[PDB]
Write a protein that holds these residues in place. Sequence first.
Motif, PDB file in Angstrom:
ATOM      1  N   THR A  52       0.865  -1.306   0.047  1.00 33.54           N
ATOM      2  CA  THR A  52       0.073   0.168  -0.013  1.00 33.54           C
ATOM      3  C   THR A  52       0.685   1.050   0.001  1.00 33.54           C
ATOM      4  O   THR A  52       0.250   2.282   0.538  1.00 33.54           O
ATOM      5  CB  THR A  52      -1.002   0.022   1.150  1.00 33.54           C
ATOM      6  OG1 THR A  52      -0.081  -0.291   2.422  1.00 33.54           O
ATOM      7  CG2 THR A  52      -1.899  -1.279   0.984  1.00 33.54           C
ATOM      8  N   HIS A  53       1.936   1.312  -0.348  1.00 32.16           N
ATOM      9  CA  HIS A  53       2.889   2.499  -0.708  1.00 32.16           C
ATOM     10  C   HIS A  53       2.211   3.431  -1.750  1.00 32.16           C
ATOM     11  O   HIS A  53       2.214   2.695  -2.853  1.00 32.16           O
ATOM     12  CB  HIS A  53       4.273   1.970  -1.106  1.00 32.16           C
ATOM     13  CG  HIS A  53       5.023   3.485  -0.941  1.00 32.16           C
ATOM     14  ND1 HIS A  53       4.990   4.212  -1.759  1.00 32.16           N
ATOM     15  CD2 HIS A  53       5.829   3.597   0.307  1.00 32.16           C
ATOM     16  CE1 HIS A  53       5.550   5.320  -0.825  1.00 32.16           C
ATOM     17  NE2 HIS A  53       6.142   4.920   0.170  1.00 32.16           N
ATOM     18  N   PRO A  54       2.135   4.559  -1.353  1.00 31.78           N
ATOM     19  CA  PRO A  54       1.634   5.564  -2.346  1.00 31.78           C
ATOM     20  C   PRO A  54       2.225   5.898  -3.473  1.00 31.78           C
ATOM     21  O   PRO A  54       1.482   5.900  -4.668  1.00 31.78           O
ATOM     22  CB  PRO A  54       1.386   7.015  -1.391  1.00 31.78           C
ATOM     23  CG  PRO A  54       1.502   6.332   0.069  1.00 31.78           C
ATOM     24  CD  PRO A  54       2.396   4.880  -0.007  1.00 31.78           C
ATOM     25  N   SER A  55       3.308   5.855  -3.557  1.00 39.19           N
ATOM     26  CA  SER A  55       4.466   6.126  -4.691  1.00 39.19           C
ATOM     27  C   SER A  55       4.142   4.924  -5.747  1.00 39.19           C
ATOM     28  O   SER A  55       4.589   5.232  -7.031  1.00 39.19           O
ATOM     29  CB  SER A  55       5.634   6.093  -4.343  1.00 39.19           C
ATOM     30  OG  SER A  55       6.187   4.871  -3.487  1.00 39.19           O
ATOM     31  N   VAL A  56       3.888   3.391  -5.467  1.00 37.72           N
ATOM     32  CA  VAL A  56       4.024   2.485  -6.409  1.00 37.72           C
ATOM     33  C   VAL A  56       3.015   1.424  -5.955  1.00 37.72           C
ATOM     34  O   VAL A  56       3.069   0.456  -5.140  1.00 37.72           O
ATOM     35  CB  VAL A  56       5.263   1.797  -6.546  1.00 37.72           C
ATOM     36  CG1 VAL A  56       5.438   0.471  -7.482  1.00 37.72           C
ATOM     37  CG2 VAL A  56       6.718   2.605  -6.369  1.00 37.72           C
ATOM     38  N   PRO A  57       1.800   1.619  -6.589  1.00 37.79           N
ATOM     39  CA  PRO A  57       0.582   0.911  -6.266  1.00 37.79           C
ATOM     40  C   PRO A  57       0.622  -0.326  -6.971  1.00 37.79           C
ATOM     41  O   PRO A  57       1.039  -0.465  -8.008  1.00 37.79           O
ATOM     42  CB  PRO A  57      -0.755   2.026  -6.944  1.00 37.79           C
ATOM     43  CG  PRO A  57       0.004   3.225  -7.362  1.00 37.79           C
ATOM     44  CD  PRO A  57       1.501   2.921  -7.339  1.00 37.79           C
ATOM     45  N   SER A  58      -0.307  -1.045  -6.087  1.00 40.97           N
ATOM     46  CA  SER A  58      -0.608  -2.386  -6.687  1.00 40.97           C
ATOM     47  C   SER A  58      -2.208  -2.498  -6.945  1.00 40.97           C
ATOM     48  O   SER A  58      -2.836  -1.901  -6.277  1.00 40.97           O
ATOM     49  CB  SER A  58      -0.491  -3.611  -5.563  1.00 40.97           C
ATOM     50  OG  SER A  58       0.842  -3.579  -4.982  1.00 40.97           O
ATOM     51  N   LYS A  59      -2.190  -2.987  -8.161  1.00 39.88           N
ATOM     52  CA  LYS A  59      -3.723  -2.960  -8.556  1.00 39.88           C
ATOM     53  C   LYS A  59      -4.457  -4.064  -8.865  1.00 39.88           C
ATOM     54  O   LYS A  59      -4.071  -5.127  -9.334  1.00 39.88           O
ATOM     55  CB  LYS A  59      -3.984  -2.017  -9.993  1.00 39.88           C
ATOM     56  CG  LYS A  59      -3.432  -0.669  -9.762  1.00 39.88           C
ATOM     57  CD  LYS A  59      -3.448   0.070 -11.188  1.00 39.88           C
ATOM     58  CE  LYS A  59      -2.437   1.343 -10.891  1.00 39.88           C
ATOM     59  NZ  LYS A  59      -1.721   1.842 -12.351  1.00 39.88           N
ATOM     60  N   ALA A  60      -5.709  -4.144  -8.145  1.00 33.07           N
ATOM     61  CA  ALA A  60      -6.657  -5.275  -8.133  1.00 33.07           C
ATOM     62  C   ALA A  60      -7.086  -5.393  -9.454  1.00 33.07           C
ATOM     63  O   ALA A  60      -8.231  -4.820  -9.849  1.00 33.07           O
ATOM     64  CB  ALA A  60      -7.659  -5.135  -6.922  1.00 33.07           C
ATOM     65  N   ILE A  61      -6.488  -6.264 -10.430  1.00 34.36           N
ATOM     66  CA  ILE A  61      -6.893  -6.463 -11.726  1.00 34.36           C
ATOM     67  C   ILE A  61      -8.574  -6.932 -11.817  1.00 34.36           C
ATOM     68  O   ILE A  61      -8.949  -6.519 -12.881  1.00 34.36           O
ATOM     69  CB  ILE A  61      -5.911  -7.448 -12.277  1.00 34.36           C
ATOM     70  CG1 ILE A  61      -6.201  -8.838 -12.247  1.00 34.36           C
ATOM     71  CG2 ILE A  61      -4.621  -7.030 -12.054  1.00 34.36           C
ATOM     72  CD1 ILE A  61      -5.635  -9.647 -13.076  1.00 34.36           C
ATOM     73  N   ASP A  62      -8.731  -7.741 -10.871  1.00 28.76           N
ATOM     74  CA  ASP A  62     -10.104  -8.136 -11.095  1.00 28.76           C
ATOM     75  C   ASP A  62     -11.096  -7.245 -10.248  1.00 28.76           C
ATOM     76  O   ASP A  62     -12.398  -7.514 -10.480  1.00 28.76           O
ATOM     77  CB  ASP A  62     -10.182  -9.737 -10.597  1.00 28.76           C
ATOM     78  CG  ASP A  62      -9.427 -10.835 -11.501  1.00 28.76           C
ATOM     79  OD1 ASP A  62      -9.345 -10.308 -12.726  1.00 28.76           O
ATOM     80  OD2 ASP A  62      -8.968 -11.507 -11.093  1.00 28.76           O
ATOM     81  N   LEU A  63     -10.685  -6.512  -9.401  1.00 32.74           N
ATOM     82  CA  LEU A  63     -11.456  -5.635  -8.660  1.00 32.74           C
ATOM     83  C   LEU A  63     -11.375  -4.112  -9.088  1.00 32.74           C
ATOM     84  O   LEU A  63     -11.270  -3.350  -8.483  1.00 32.74           O
ATOM     85  CB  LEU A  63     -11.168  -5.550  -7.321  1.00 32.74           C
ATOM     86  CG  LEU A  63     -11.122  -6.987  -6.465  1.00 32.74           C
ATOM     87  CD1 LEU A  63     -11.144  -6.600  -5.107  1.00 32.74           C
ATOM     88  CD2 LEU A  63     -12.681  -7.655  -6.706  1.00 32.74           C
ATOM     89  N   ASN A  64     -11.651  -4.338 -10.783  1.00 32.58           N
ATOM     90  CA  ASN A  64     -11.918  -2.914 -11.330  1.00 32.58           C
ATOM     91  C   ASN A  64     -10.448  -2.152 -11.333  1.00 32.58           C
ATOM     92  O   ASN A  64     -10.555  -0.894 -11.483  1.00 32.58           O
ATOM     93  CB  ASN A  64     -13.028  -2.205 -10.631  1.00 32.58           C
ATOM     94  CG  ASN A  64     -13.828  -1.577 -11.691  1.00 32.58           C
ATOM     95  OD1 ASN A  64     -14.530  -2.402 -12.224  1.00 32.58           O
ATOM     96  ND2 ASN A  64     -13.901  -0.369 -11.810  1.00 32.58           N
ATOM     97  N   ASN A  65      -9.539  -2.758 -11.241  1.00 37.74           N
ATOM     98  CA  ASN A  65      -7.955  -2.092 -11.491  1.00 37.74           C
ATOM     99  C   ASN A  65      -7.945  -1.159 -10.070  1.00 37.74           C
ATOM    100  O   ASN A  65      -6.881  -0.403 -10.228  1.00 37.74           O
ATOM    101  CB  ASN A  65      -7.969  -1.577 -12.778  1.00 37.74           C
ATOM    102  CG  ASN A  65      -6.892  -2.168 -13.581  1.00 37.74           C
ATOM    103  OD1 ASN A  65      -6.416  -3.354 -13.049  1.00 37.74           O
ATOM    104  ND2 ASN A  65      -6.096  -1.383 -14.455  1.00 37.74           N
TER     105      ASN A  65
END
Length: 440
Positions: A52-65
């Motif tokens: 959950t680092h603000p600078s480099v996000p991890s996106k939930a590909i199945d949860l609408n990115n």
Amino acid sequence: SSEKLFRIQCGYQNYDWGKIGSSSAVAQFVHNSDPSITIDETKPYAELWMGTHPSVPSKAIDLNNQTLRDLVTAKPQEYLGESIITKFGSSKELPFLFKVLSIEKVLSIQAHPDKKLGAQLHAADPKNYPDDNHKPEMAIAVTDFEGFCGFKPLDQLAKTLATVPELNEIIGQELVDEFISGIKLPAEVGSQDDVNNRKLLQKVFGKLMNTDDDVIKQQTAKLLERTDREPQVFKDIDSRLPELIQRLNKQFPNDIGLFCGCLLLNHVGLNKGEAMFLQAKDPHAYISGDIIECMAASDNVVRAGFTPKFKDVKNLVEMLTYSYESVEKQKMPLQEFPRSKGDAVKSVLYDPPIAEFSVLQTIFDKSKGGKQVIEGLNGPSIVIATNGKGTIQITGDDSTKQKIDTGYVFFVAPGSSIELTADSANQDQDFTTYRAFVEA
Ligand SMILES: [Zn+2]
């Protein structure tokens, strides 16, 4: 799609010390996870960030990115859980940062404050000490790794001082003398001999670290000629040393790190699967390899060498513990994990003596395959597959059963039980996963 177990596409950094292109695990992982992404065979892929680092996000590909930070923020009790919100005081993010590092060139020789020093530094020098916190770190080898970690045993240091003219020169015969005469070896922690041994180490270290640049430049040149002219002298200390010096000088010509890293610290080799915990006030550096790294959120670093950045020698010399345990003592013990059961041939807990994180290592034999079931944990988790392939699901709910290939990363909500199975057909490698978590 599930909101309990879901895949995340994670960002990466292209720092110049990273392995270049597809030789990098970061690159491999990124690519495998999203082949949409074409790897630039020319660029370094240094770090893969998971969390959950603000600078480099991890996106939930199945949860609408959507962003994990966003999801968490939006639903903290569900994603973090009460106990975690309370304990760490946030509702927006995880208490740890989880990464993959792919190291081509040596990073800085560094040490991190404990909380007490962290607050002190922050109050006095906010420009250099961004936060208030400690910064525990743990490294796990994905591929064979090398680093520096802790002062060498004193007997090894006495041999080095007596034997390496350029070092002896910098320290001074009186001080060398005093050190070699002074140390009380069969001596255990907290004893007056232990105490006085650290005072002696501190004097030696302080003398080195306060030496002028010009002198360092001169002495390092001489040192390199000697590695060349008299390899045996170095090999007598450690068979790897002369080539280590030469390798690191190629990266950082005439750096003080050639002295304070190569000659004073343990040169640790981690086989894949082994771990090291980087405690506060203990010097270390990453030299090469691909690792899993877990850490608290801090930026507090005190640097000693192999860097262009600010080296706070004053604070450095005063903050170290001046511990001098073996290379063997630098590696973490294997712990069992009762809340996991099944066919895995390795199911190991790496439990650092800090609160922010724990890692569970699960390995299946490539041949044997099988299943493993893990109870629901009382906090959030991130799972990455580093090798092989299998499936992941919420125990007993086949509608959640998904592919977990090499480089795939998943978020696992607190309380969800997980079932892993190793690829029946695919038997190239041992299906290997690492799960970073926290429980209050
Ligand atoms: Zn560190």
